[PDB]
């Protein structure tokens, strides 16, 4: 069908030919997941099969492949060429212990310091606010006793 | 001496999130970098805190609970290089050389690198190296020309000579 | 790899950076301390690095004043080579022939007459200095 | 190769994702569990997480989420922003 | 080396005497292998904690080989407890789910009480009309 | 993430990229800091010490009382310290050997200059028109057609360049080359013809390693890149071993029949056998004699250093170490199976887990799991000391690790474990205000439960422990379908989370409740089944009235009761309640259904069909049609309006009300 | 689709398997010897006011009609399909919450229900944003779900069948919007892993059956599971290579011609 | 102990989407192992995590370092690779 119709044609062919496998009779069908298997097969042109190993591809370095097994050769060969692995992999990743991009690991977090800063008041002032003579021999005065900075630095 | 921009990461702990983190991050920075030394940048005299202090980030750690705050800062550093002429302050004088001292770095002037006009006198009140009227004791900044420097354990150490013209007693 | 003296040679980043002056450096340090004290309990360990600098800086105060530095700056101008600059203002004295010896990298960089004029201004500035 | 995105021209969905809720609550849990500045009147809880949830409900919890795009760019979202 | 004994249960013979209540990781025999204060090793065998109960009997004979040779047997009653397997002779693999005391159980009307009671849904689908007949 | 000797130092920064290179003799030597001149080492110094070049130097320690200088302590935290093993006897290399053999014709001996010319501009260009690590195909094709040289490089002639010169032709200069090669067993043979005056075909004529390496090293730098090689990571001149590295014991094993004895593996041993065969060959360097016989022993290093890699490289070597049995090689462990790969990298055992036989219980909420004390008294579940816990959390310790509501271990700042067992068992040791303490498990307290084989997304879903006695896992019948497994004495595994950040995942995403509807089919996967189901029918019948006498009794399940007793449907002589009435009680308020089965009329006509209103049924009879994983299933319909719970309560109500009805209704066959 | 499998309920298109003759008797409206709605317009008719209304009524059907023809032109004949957010239910229960029977005519206005949608279909976005042209992937990444909302909320429908009122309707269009965005899947996520697992379970359910017992048979033969591997292996030798070829007719619809 | 966390098993976390549970039940609750990597040639160092002495007899490093979490599982393999003369350089972040 790929040789004589479309490539798009042949996708529809899969979808149909898989339904006819798990439906007769009374069978748990979801058009969504069926849909996905097909697009994966016909998403790179040729019909990528799924034999006990995982689409005989090869574009994500070795580290990853080593997971699909069987390792060996792969490393014994890839080594002789220094194959860079962006480690964008998900099994390559659960191999190193780095946190994997498994959905809930597919994002990072920081902190909204902004909230902690402007955060609600705030209710008092002012004396204590800008002082420095309640014991600490040292002085202060908020910050305006007659002194600059930068300028000099620039010069 | 140089005024340069350096980086440093501060790994803060939940206990100190409060509402004035900015201050904490700055306080921690001054403490971790000031006084330190590296072969790459040398002695980190001090950090030009205020205005010249950037606080980017940060991203909290997954399995730790600590957040990493990258910080860009301006600092005064003292890095020496072979061939540089500097004024130093003599500290000790032994029949082994001249234990000078420039700022925070220690410079050693091997006796073999000292003119043949400065004989070593151990009998003289305070061990010195006169000639030659010129008397270099434990109190006479000399001029030397760094011949070689080394960096062993963040610390730096080099040797200077007095063989060229316009070097020596100051 | 790179462990020469030159002749202006060595680290690229460091080369790029501008060598801070002695007197000016000390002034900036002082300024920095003043800003920190602005609200201190008292103490603030100066470690060991501070002590040394505090001494060397004072023992080399080529401009014991807040204006001296500015005067020096005014006198200068043309960059040429950050290093050479800070070096010339850190040594002092005096003649051309001597300048080349100390800074061989000056070879055919600058003339003489001019140099002499600068030295005279510095000698009078050191005090002056009042 | 990042790129950063305009806090003004954000693309992604304004709502907070199934997975994120799960990661945030996971994250503050550890934080508070680690004696941390709790940002809402302590109801009188014990569970470093059941507390974090008290926070989430009131959207009074720090932490932001950087959503990396395929490009390599990202977006930052505030817990109070999200839905 | 050897801790968490206790060897307090071995006789002068270095072997246990039936029927001493043995439990835990208790030990029952003792070994020694030469190499101040040196040297005695310990290649003696303990008792898996997962087991308990007393000691039926021990039999000490000779091997050839040409040394001594001991065998220890311990008994451990086992009662039915929730979670034990039972099945009839028709492949009604069953497990105990609960243990009701005499009053609760359907005392009727003769009035006896069921010793065990299986559920009716383990019939029609597994068609096993023999279990019934029996 | 846990603790690891508060290493601190080098911040952290997780691994981001992985660079796969090809070790190099030079590097192998530098990296290694040991010697290794005592081939038959094994502490064979006449005592029980060590040295020199096997155990010590340094290497990485093997027991407690040892601080193997360089790091520590032991036995862990101290990784193996690789080391070089000189050589000075050109050695082969099976694996990488195969490739090196295939090349033959990628530079020609010995000038070492790419075969192609320019060239031949298509051949050379075509080979490049393909990403690296593949262009090999082109090279092999050229070698099969090659076998001779030409003039000398592309040196002008006429001389010029603007922009020239071409000026060239071809493929440098020399001759060859000219003789192909074939693989016979573990030896290389080639013929040399032209011809027509004298040559050789397929019979004999070998080569060597020292010769090949030399030629490679000569290879031009711009040439090393011309092929699928890396003048930085992979360098042909590396295919040949010279400083054979030596992994630290950490990678190997040992043993000790304590006492008298302490054999090793096994394995390794061979490694010592190889140095035995090398030192006896290196000492003869001054000879000389017999010379021709010396090569016969050199062939043995060609075999041993191979058996160490590929026991059976398909040549008929044997590699018998004990009783003529393959010598556990390095390639054996990698891709076993029965080893790493799929046993030490994919499916790893794990800890903080347990399993036992399952049992039924009708009395647990859906998201509930009965955990026997026996286990609860052995789990955890760290939990840092909050300022909210100190008092509460302390009580646990003071209780003991043998009292459910107790704990084991107390972790401190320095990272030291205060075993509550025999160790502690006292010392008020108040309780820090920032350290960690490991407790027992107590009340959901979520934990995840699976059943091997776990096909469906939901063979691992998360429950809430607590906590019953007797030694099985009580779980909820309506949850049995997802685990496609009855109580035939089955086992099910429990994995307890530790960190408070996962405890969150398996609470907010994975939960028997939020997993009652797999997207496999956008249909429910759990529903009323077995006795509670048989019961529904035999009780949703409008033949079954309820005596006022209870009602009452059965109202104590709901479990969240309005408190108000339902308005009676029958006020006639006795006050009676219909079986539908009190059932429709445990259904949410405001869910509608119009089932409309086959034959159905304006009439009833006869309890045929089903239809609910403001959370009250009025029509037909409840069976699997409606309280089972049906399409527009009632279970489906409150899930999905209004989410799990009171949704989660639905299974608790009916599966509690009805079971209670059935108890006194009796049923059997 | 753009939606999370797990939140979805097969649904039905009333507007499909209908005779054009009865189609018109459900959606179309006119002033031609009709005006039967005025009996419901209560309270408040207008009446008919000035143009506009008369015009909205034929414009609604221009699109409710471009939907009747396409589909079909796309879907064979089936009608039951799985969409997000059960609409057929948000209306009941909804006529439980507010009730109101035929006796109470609609306090609504034909110029509202039509705005109602347009404002709350354009609230169902799943691809963001605009970013012009990027609004296209979205306009038809919900196009199917859309023809529903113009078929169960088209004008004549909300006044003839199940009379609604401002409050009810305003609340209906409420839950929809909400239940929709609550149905948008991910990001995340892992749509292949979960989907792949579900695809495996189904096969296991067939394998057995395709063999069970089970004969015994002929023609059409092929088998299940046992075949699966054949498809995934794209192997040439697939036992039952079969192949179905259709005809015109003619030829044929007859027999002896065939 | 212990138990056993099958390939099968792990494929199921991934379905839900639990980065952290997954990571916890493979690189923590079994092989909690940490090592220190050189930034140029990503390999085991002469680390001491006590006297802050790291050093590198090869790349000549003493200031540039980074830490990595790996399963002793992983550890072995990388080491076992060293015996086959191949160097998995763990080029971390910018530390490259
Ligand atoms: Mg069975
Ligand atoms: Zn070590
Ligand atoms: Zn040649
Ligand atoms: Zn290194």
What the block records as the tokens of F139 is: 């090279």
Pairing of the two strands F576-578 and B108-110: unpaired
Compute the C-alpha angle H50/H56/H60, nearest 5°: 135
The CATH fold assigned to C1-130 is Growth Hormone; Chain: A; (1.20.1250)
Cβ <8 Å between F457 and G198: yes
- Cβ neighbors of F529 (< 8 A, separation 6 or more) are F477, F478, F480, F481, F624, F628
Cβ <8 Å between H5 and F347: yes
Rounded-to-integer distance, Cα G89 and Cα F322, Å: 77
- Give the ligand with the smallest distance to the CA of H36: 4
Quick one: which of F241, F378, F577, F662 has its CA closest to E119? F662
Domain residue limits, chain B:
1-81, 82-170
Residue F460: its H or E element: strand F460-464
For residue F195, what is the DSSP state?
S
Contact present, G138 and G125 (Cβ < 8 Å):
yes
Full residue range of the structural domain in which residue H24 is found: 1-84
Q: How far is F592 from chain G (nearest CA, A)?
A: 6
Contact present, F613 and F592 (Cβ < 8 Å):
yes
Count Cβ–Cβ pairs < 8 Å, chain D vs chain G. Answer: 19
**Ligand 1 centroid – CA E123 distance (Å):** 12
Contact present, F350 and H5 (Cβ < 8 Å):
yes
Chain H, residues 64-93, CB within 8 A of chain A, namely: 68-71, 74, 81, 84, 86
- Give the ligand with the smallest distance to the CA of F71: 2
The verdict on residue H94 lying in a domain is no
**Ligand 3 centroid – CA H58 distance (Å):** 36
| CA distances, F328 to each of A66, F60, F313, F338, G252 (Å) | 21, 23, 13, 13, 72
**Beta-bridge partners for F245:** F84
What are the two backbone dihedrals, phi and then psi, of residue F152, each rounded to the nearest 5 degrees? -150, 105
Phi-psi domain of D58 (left: phi exceeds 0; alpha: psi -120 through 50; beta: other): alpha
Residue E85: its H or E element: strand E85-86
Judged by a CB distance cut-off of 8 A, whether residue A136 touches chain H is no
- Cβ neighbors of F663 (< 8 A, separation 6 or more) are none
- Cβ neighbors of B156 (< 8 A, separation 6 or more) are B37, B39, B42, B43, B79, B80, B105, B149, B150
Give the rounded distance of the alpha carbon of F415 from its chain centre: 28
H29 is known to lie in a ligand binding site: no
The verdict on residue H78 lying in a domain is yes
The three-class DSSP label of residue F74 is coil
What the block records as the tokens of F28 is: 């192998």
Rounded-to-integer distance, Cα D30 and Cα D36, Å: 9
The three-class DSSP label of residue G105 is coil
Angle of the H7-16 helix axis to the G191-209 helix axis, nearest 10: 120
Kindly list the partner chains of chain G, i.e. chains with 3 or more CB atom pairs below 8 Å: A, D, F, H
For residue F152, what is the DSSP state?
B
* CATH class, range B1-81: alpha beta
Rounded-to-integer distance, Cα F327 and Cα F270, Å: 8
User: In H, which residues are within 8 Å of D23 by CB distance?
Assistant: 19-20
| Residue-by-residue DSSP string for A1-66 | -TTTS-HHHHHHHHHHHHHTTS-SSS----HHHHHHHHHHHTSSSS-----TTSTT---SHHHHHH
Experimental method reported for this structure = X-ray
Give the rounded distance of the alpha carbon of B90 from its chain centre: 16
Residue F313 buriedness (CB in 10 A; 0-12 / 13-18 / 19+): buried
What the block records as the tokens of F387 is: 């300022």
- Chain B meets chain G (3+ C-beta pairs below 8 A): no
Contact present, F445 and F462 (Cβ < 8 Å):
no
Chain H, residues 2-21, CB within 8 A of chain G, namely: 11-12, 14-15, 17
Sign of torsion, CA F443 F445 F446 F450?
negative
**Ligand 2 centroid – CA F72 distance (Å):** 6
What are the two backbone dihedrals, phi and then psi, of residue G161, each rounded to the nearest 5 degrees? -90, 135
Rounded-to-integer distance, Cα F274 and Cα G48, Å: 105
Could you give the domains of chain D? 1-83 (3.90.940.10)
Judged by a CB distance cut-off of 8 A, whether residue G178 touches chain F is no
User: In A, which residues are within 8 Å of C73 by CB distance?
Assistant: 155
The verdict on residue H89 lying in a domain is no
The verdict on residue H28 lying in a domain is yes
- Residue whose structure tokens are 């709502």: D15
Contact present, B75 and B44 (Cβ < 8 Å):
yes
Long-range contact list for B36-39, CB < 8 A, 24+ apart? B36/B154, B37/B104, B37/B154, B37/B155, B37/B156, B38/B151, B38/B154, B38/H63, B39/B151, B39/B154, B39/B156, B39/H63
CATH, range B82-170: 2.40.50.140
What the block records as the tokens of A63 is: 């580290």
Rounded-to-integer distance, Cα F348 and Cα H6, Å: 7
| Residue-by-residue DSSP string for F474-501 | EEEGGGSGGGT--SSS-EEEEE---STT
Q: What is the largest CA-CA distance in chain E?
A: 79
Rounded-to-integer distance, Cα G81 and Cα F301, Å: 72
Q: What share of residues in chain A are helix, strand, coil (percent, to 5)?
A: 35, 5, 60
User: In A, which residues are within 8 Å of D71 by CB distance?
Assistant: none
Kindly list the partner chains of chain A, i.e. chains with 3 or more CB atom pairs below 8 Å: B, C, D, F, G, H
Sign of torsion, CA F297 F300 F305 F308?
negative
Cβ <8 Å between H13 and A102: yes
Pairing of the two strands B67-78 and B53-55: antiparallel
User: In A, which residues are within 8 Å of H86 by CB distance?
Assistant: 75, 79
Chain D, residues 16-55, CB within 8 A of chain A, namely: 19-20, 22-24, 27
| Residue-by-residue DSSP string for G131-199 | STTTTHHHHTSSHHHHHHHTTSSSHHHHHHSS---HHHHHHHHHHHHHHHHTTB--SS--HHHHHHHHH
Rounded-to-integer distance, Cα B86 and Cα B97, Å: 18
Question: Which of A53, A54, A81 would you mutate first to test chain F, the one with the most F CBs within 10 A?
Answer: A81
User: In C, which residues are within 8 Å of B102 by CB distance?
Assistant: 56
Nearest to H58 among F31, F499, F501 (CB): F31
For residue F517, the chain G residue with the least C-alpha distance is G6
Rounded-to-integer distance, Cα G132 and Cα G128, Å: 10
The verdict on residue H96 lying in a domain is no
Kindly list the partner chains of chain B, i.e. chains with 3 or more CB atom pairs below 8 Å: A, C, D, F, H
Rounded-to-integer distance, Cα H95 and Cα H45, Å: 15
SS3 for chain B, per residue? CEEEEEEEEEECCHHHCCCCHHHHHHHHHHHHHCCCEECCCEEEEEECCCCCEEECCCEECCCCCCEEEEEEEEEEEECCCCCCEEECCCCEEECCEEECCECCECCEEEHHHCCCCCCCECCCCCCEEECCCCEECCCCCEEEEEEEEEECCCCEEEEEECCCCCCEEC
Judged by a CB distance cut-off of 8 A, whether residue F11 touches chain B is yes
Residues measured by CB to lie within 5 Å of ligand 2, the ion: F 60, 68, 70-71, 78
Q: How far is A124 from chain G (nearest CA, A)?
A: 44
* Helices and strands per DSSP (H, E), number in chain F: 18, 19
| Continuous H helices in C1-130 | 12-16, 22-37, 49-58, 66-75, 82-91, 96-102, 113-125
Could you give the domains of chain F? 1-329 (no CATH), 352-378+442-515 (2.40.40.20), 379-441 (3.30.1490.180), 516-668 (1.10.274.100)
Contact present, B24 and B82 (Cβ < 8 Å):
no
Question: Which of F64, F262, F359 would you mutate first to test chain E, the one with the most E CBs within 10 A?
Answer: F359
Pairing of the two strands F517-518 and F460-464: unpaired
Residues measured by CB to lie within 5 Å of ligand 4, the ion: H 38, 41, 56, 58-59
Pairing of the two strands F353-361 and F473-476: parallel
User: In A, which residues are within 8 Å of F523 by CB distance?
Assistant: 28
Rounded-to-integer distance, Cα G16 and Cα G77, Å: 8
Q: How far is F69 from chain A (nearest CA, A)?
A: 28
Count other C-beta atoms under 10 Å from residue B93's C-beta.
23
Rounded-to-integer distance, Cα C23 and Cα C52, Å: 15
- Cβ neighbors of B75 (< 8 A, separation 6 or more) are B3, B4, B5, B6, B33, B44, B45, B46, B47, B48
Domain residue limits, chain C:
1-130
The verdict on residue H60 lying in a domain is yes
Count other C-beta atoms under 10 Å from residue F543's C-beta.
9
- Cβ neighbors of F559 (< 8 A, separation 6 or more) are F649, F652, F653, F656
Asked if omega into G175 is within 30° of 0 (cis), the reply is no
Contact present, G203 and G227 (Cβ < 8 Å):
no
Give the rounded distance of the alpha carbon of F80 from its chain centre: 23
Binding residues of F for Zn(2+): 68, 71, 78, 81, 108, 111, 149, 174
H56 is known to lie in a ligand binding site: yes
Cβ <8 Å between A111 and D63: yes
Quick one: which of F661, F648, F447, F403 has its CA closest to F554? F661
Compute the C-alpha angle E109/E114/E120, nearest 5°: 105
| Residue-by-residue DSSP string for G145-159 | HHHHHTTSSSHHHHH
Rounded-to-integer distance, Cα A65 and Cα A62, Å: 5
Question: Which of B63, B67, B68, B71 would you mutate first to test chain F, the one with the most F CBs within 10 A?
Answer: B63
Judged by a CB distance cut-off of 8 A, whether residue D33 touches chain B is yes
Contact present, G108 and G166 (Cβ < 8 Å):
yes
Judged by a CB distance cut-off of 8 A, whether residue C38 touches chain A is yes
Rounded-to-integer distance, Cα F522 and Cα G9, Å: 7
Judged by a CB distance cut-off of 8 A, whether residue B11 touches chain H is no
Quick one: which of F165, F166, F125 has its CA closest to F142? F125
**Beta-bridge partners for B86:** B144
Compute, in degrees rounded to 10, the torsion defined by CA atoms F475, F480, F485, F488. Answer: 50
- Chain B meets chain F (3+ C-beta pairs below 8 A): yes
Rounded-to-integer distance, Cα H27 and Cα A97, Å: 5
Q: How far is A141 from chain D (nearest CA, A)?
A: 29
Q: How far is C84 from chain A (nearest CA, A)?
A: 18
Contact present, B119 and B167 (Cβ < 8 Å):
no
**Beta-bridge partners for F353:** F495
**Beta-bridge partners for F357:** F491
| CA distances, F618 to each of F604, F621, F641, G10 (Å) | 10, 9, 20, 25
Cβ <8 Å between B14 and D27: no
Rounded-to-integer distance, Cα F583 and Cα F659, Å: 12
Judged by a CB distance cut-off of 8 A, whether residue B18 touches chain H is no
The three-class DSSP label of residue F91 is strand
Using only the alpha carbons of chain B, give its radius of gyration. 22
What are the two backbone dihedrals, phi and then psi, of residue A146, each rounded to the nearest 5 degrees? 105, 70
Nearest to A155 among C37, C42, C73 (CB): C73
Cβ <8 Å between C28 and A152: yes
| CA distances, B154 to each of B44, E71, F7, F71 (Å) | 11, 68, 19, 20
């Amino acid at each position: 069908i790929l040789q004589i119709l479309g490539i798009e044609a042949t996708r529809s062919a899969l979808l149909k030919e898989l339904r006819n496998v798990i439906e007769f009779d009374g069978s748990y069908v979801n058009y969504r997941h069926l849909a996905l298997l097909c697009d994966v097969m016909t998403s790179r042109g040729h019909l990528m099969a799924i034999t006990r190993h995982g689409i005989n591809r090869a574009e994500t370095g070795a580290l990853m492949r080593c997971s699909f097994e069987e390792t060996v050769e792969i490393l014994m060969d890839a080594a002789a060429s220094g194959e860079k692995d962006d480690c964008k992999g998900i099994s390559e990743n659960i191999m190193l212990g780095q946190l994997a991009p498994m959905g809930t690991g597919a994002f990072d977090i920081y902190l909204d310091q902004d909230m902690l800063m402007n955060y609600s008041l705030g209710t008092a002032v002012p004396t204590l606010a800008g002082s420095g003579m309640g014991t600490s021999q040292l002085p202060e005065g908020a910050g305006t006793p007659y002194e600059r900075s930068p300028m000099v630095d620039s010069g | 001496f140089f005024l340069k921009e350096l980086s440093l990461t501060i790994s803060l702990h939940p206990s100190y999130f409060g509402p004035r983190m900015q201050d904490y991050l700055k306080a921690k920075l001054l403490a971790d970098v000031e006084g330190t030394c590296s072969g790459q940048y040398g002695y980190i005299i001090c950090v030009l805190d205020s205005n010249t202090i950037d606080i980017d980030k940060g991203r909290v750690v997954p399995g730790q609970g600590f957040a990493e705050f990258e910080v860009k800062y301006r600092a005064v550093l003292w890095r020496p290089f072979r061939g540089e002429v500097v004024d130093a302050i003599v500290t000790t004088v032994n029949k082994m050389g001249f234990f000078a001292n420039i700022g925070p770095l220690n410079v050693f002037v091997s006796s073999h690198l000292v003119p043949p006009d400065m004989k070593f006198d151990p009998t003289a009140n305070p061990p010195n190296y006169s000639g030659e009227d010129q008397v270099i004791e434990k109190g006479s900044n000399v001029r030397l020309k760094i011949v070689g420097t080394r960096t062993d354990a963040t610390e730096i150490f080099a040797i200077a000579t007095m063989k060229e013209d316009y070097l020596g007693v100051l | 790899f790179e462990e020469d003296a030159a002749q202006l040679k060595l680290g690229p980043e460091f080369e790029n950076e501008d060598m801070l002056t002695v007197s000016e450096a000390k002034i900036l340090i002082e300024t920095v301390l003043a800003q920190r004290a602005r609200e201190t309990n008292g103490e603030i360990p100066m470690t060991d690095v501070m002590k040394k600098t505090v001494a060397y800086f004072n023992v080399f105060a080529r401009f014991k004043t807040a204006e001296a530095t500015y005067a020096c700056e005014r006198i200068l101008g043309n960059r040429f080579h950050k290093f050479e600059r800070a070096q010339l203002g850190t040594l002092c004295c005096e003649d051309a022939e001597e300048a080349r010896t100390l800074i061989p990298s000056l070879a055919n960089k600058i003339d003489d007459q001019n140099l002499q004029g600068i030295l005279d201004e510095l000698s009078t500035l050191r005090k002056f200095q009042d | 190769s990042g790129k950063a995105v305009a806090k003004e021209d954000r693309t992604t969905t304004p709502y907070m994702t199934k997975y994120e809720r799960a990661r945030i609550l996971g994250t503050r849990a550890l934080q508070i569990s680690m004696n941390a500045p709790v940002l809402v009147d302590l109801e009188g809880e014990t569970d470093p997480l059941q507390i974090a949830m008290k926070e989430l409900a009131q959207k009074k919890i720090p932490l932001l989420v950087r959503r990396y795009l395929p490009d390599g760019s990202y977006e930052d979202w505030s817990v109070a922003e999200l839905i | 080396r050897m801790k968490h004994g206790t060897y307090d249960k071995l006789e002068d013979d270095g072997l246990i005497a039936p029927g001493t209540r043995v439990s835990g990781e208790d030990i029952i025999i003792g070994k020694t292998a030469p190499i101040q204060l040196h040297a005695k090793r310990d290649v003696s065998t303990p008792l898996r904690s997962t087991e308990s109960g007393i000691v039926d009997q021990v039999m000490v004979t000779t091997n050839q080989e040409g040394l001594k040779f001991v065998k220890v047997r311990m008994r451990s009653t086992r009662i039915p407890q929730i979670g034990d397997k039972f099945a009839s002779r028709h492949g009604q693999k069953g497990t105990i789910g609960m243990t009701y005391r005499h009053e609760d159980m359907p005392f009727s009307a003769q009035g006896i009480v069921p010793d065990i009671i299986i559920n009716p849904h383990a019939i029609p689908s597994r068609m096993t009309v023999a279990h019934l007949v029996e | 993430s846990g603790i690891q000797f508060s290493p601190s130092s080098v911040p952290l920064r997780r691994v981001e990229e992985v660079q796969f290179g090809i070790l190099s003799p030079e590097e192998i030597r530098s990296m290694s800091v040991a010697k290794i001149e005592f081939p038959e080492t094994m502490d064979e110094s006449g005592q029980r010490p060590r040295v020199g070049g096997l155990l010590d130097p340094r290497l990485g320690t093997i027991d407690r009382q040892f601080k193997c200088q360089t790091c520590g302590e032991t036995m862990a935290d101290c990784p193996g310290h690789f080391g070089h093993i000189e050589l000075a006897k050109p050695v082969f290399h099976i694996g990488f050997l195969s490739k090196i053999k295939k090349i033959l014709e990628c530079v020609c001996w010995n000038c070492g200059k790419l075969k192609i010319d320019s060239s031949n501009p298509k051949f050379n260009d075509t080979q490049r028109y393909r990403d690296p690590k593949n262009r090999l195909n082109a090279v092999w094709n050229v070698c099969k057609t090659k076998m001779v040289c030409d003039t000398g490089l592309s040196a002008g002639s006429d001389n010029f360049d603007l922009s020239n010169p071409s000026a060239n032709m071809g493929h440098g200069g020399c001759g060859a080359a000219q003789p192909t090669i074939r693989k016979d067993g573990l030896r290389l043979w080639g013929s040399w013809k032209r011809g027509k005056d004298e040559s050789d075909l397929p019979e004999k004529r070998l080569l060597s390693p020292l010769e090949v390496h030399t030629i490679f090293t000569h290879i031009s730098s711009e040439d090393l890149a011309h092929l699928g090689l890396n003048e930085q990571y992979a360098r042909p001149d590396w295919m040949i071993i010279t400083v054979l590295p030596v992994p630290p014991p950490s990678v190997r094993p040992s043993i000790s029949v304590d006492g008298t004895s302490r054999g090793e593996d096994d394995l390794t041993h061979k490694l010592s056998d190889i140095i035995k065969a090398n030192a006896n060959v290196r000492r003869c360097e001054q000879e000389g004699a017999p010379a021709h016989i010396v090569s016969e022993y050199e062939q043995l290093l060609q075999f041993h250093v191979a058996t160490y890699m590929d026991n059976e490289i398909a040549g008929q070597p044997q590699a018998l170490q004990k009783s003529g049995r393959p010598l556990k090689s390095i390639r054996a462990r990698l891709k076993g199976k029965e080893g790493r790969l799929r046993g030490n990298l994919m499916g790893k055992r794990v800890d903080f887990s347990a399993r036992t036989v399952i049992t039924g219980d009708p009395n647990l909420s859906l998201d509930e799991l009965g955990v026997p004390r026996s286990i609860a008294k052995t789990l955890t579940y760290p939990e840092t000391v909050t300022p909210y816990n100190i008092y509460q959390l302390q009580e646990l310790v003071r209780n003991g690790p043998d009292e459910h509501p107790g704990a084991k271990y107390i972790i401190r700042d320095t990272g030291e474990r205060i075993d509550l067992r025999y160790h502690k068992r006292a010392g008020d040791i108040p309780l820090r205000y920032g350290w960690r303490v490991e407790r027992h498990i107590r009340d959901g307290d979520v934990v995840i439960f699976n059943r091997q084989p776990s096909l469906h997304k939901m063979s691992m879903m998360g429950h809430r422990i607590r906590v019953m006695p007797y030694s099985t896992f009580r779980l909820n019948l309506s949850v049995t379908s997802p685990y496609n497994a009855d109580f035939d004495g089955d086992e099910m595994n429990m994995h307890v989370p530790q960190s408070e950040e996962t405890r969150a995942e398996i609470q907010e995403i994975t939960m028997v409740p939020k997993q009652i509807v797999s997207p496999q089919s956008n249909k429910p996967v759990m529903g009323i089944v077995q006795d509670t189901l048989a019961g529904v029918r035999k009780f949703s019948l409008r033949d079954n009235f309820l005596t006022r006498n209870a009602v009452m009794n059965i109202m104590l399940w709901v479990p969240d009761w309005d408190g108000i007793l339902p308005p009676p449907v029958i006020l006639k002589p006795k006050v009676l309640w219909t079986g539908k009435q009190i059932l429709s009680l445990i259904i949410p308020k405001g869910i509608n259904l119009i089932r409309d089965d086959d034959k159905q009329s304006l009439s009833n006509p006869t309890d045929s069909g089903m239809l609910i209103e403001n959370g009250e049924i009025i029509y037909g009879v409840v069976d699997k049609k409606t309280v089972g994983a049906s399409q527009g299933g009632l279970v489906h319909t409150i899930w999905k309006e209004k989410g799990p719970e009171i949704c989660k309560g639905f299974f608790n109500g009916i599966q509690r009300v009805v079971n209670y009805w059935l108890l006194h209704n009796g049923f059997s066959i | 689709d753009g939606l999370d499998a797990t939140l979805v309920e097969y649904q039905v298109f009333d507007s499909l398997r209908l005779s054009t003759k009865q189609f018109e008797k459900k959606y179309r409206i006119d002033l031609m010897e009709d005006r039967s709605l005025s009996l419901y317009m209560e309270n408040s008719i207008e009446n008919d006011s000035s143009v506009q209304d008369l015009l909205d009524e034929e414009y609604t059907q221009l699109v409710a009609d471009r939907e009747l023809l396409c589909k079909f032109i796309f879907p064979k004949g089936d009608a039951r399909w799985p969409l997000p957010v059960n609409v057929q239910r948000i209306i009941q229960n909804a006529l439980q919450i507010f009730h109101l029977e035929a006796k109470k005519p609609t306090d609504l206005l034909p110029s509202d229900i039509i705005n109602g949608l347009n404002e709350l279909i354009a609230k169902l976005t799943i691809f963001r944003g605009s970013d012009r042209i990027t609004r296209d992937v979205q306009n038809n990444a919900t196009l199917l779900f859309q023809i529903l909302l113009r078929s169960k909320f088209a004008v004549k429908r909300v006044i003839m069948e199940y009379r609604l009122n401002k409050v009810a309707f305003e609340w209906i269009m409420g839950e929809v919007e909400a239940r929709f965005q609550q149905a948008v899947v991910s990001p995340g996520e892992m749509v292949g892993t979960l989907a792949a697992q579900s695809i495996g379970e189904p096969a296991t359910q067939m394998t057995l059956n395709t063999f069970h017992y089970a004969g015994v048979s002929s023609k059409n033969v092929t088998l299940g599971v046992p075949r699966l591997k054949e498809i995934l292996n794209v192997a040439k030798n697939i036992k039952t290579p079969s192949l179905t070829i259709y005809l015109m007719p003619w030829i044929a619809a007859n027999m002896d011609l065939a | 102990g212990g138990l056993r966390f099958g390939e099968m098993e792990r494929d199921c976390q991934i379905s839900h989407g639990c980065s952290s549970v997954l990571r916890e039940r493979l690189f923590d609750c079994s092989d909690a192992y940490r090592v220190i990597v050189c930034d140029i040639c990503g390999l085991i160092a002469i680390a001491s995590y006590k006297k802050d002495s790291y050093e590198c007899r090869s790349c000549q490093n003493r200031t540039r370092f980074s830490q990595v979490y790996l399963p002793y599982a992983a550890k072995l393999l990388f080491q076992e690779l060293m015996s086959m003369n191949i160097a998995p350089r763990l080029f971390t972040k910018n530390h490259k």
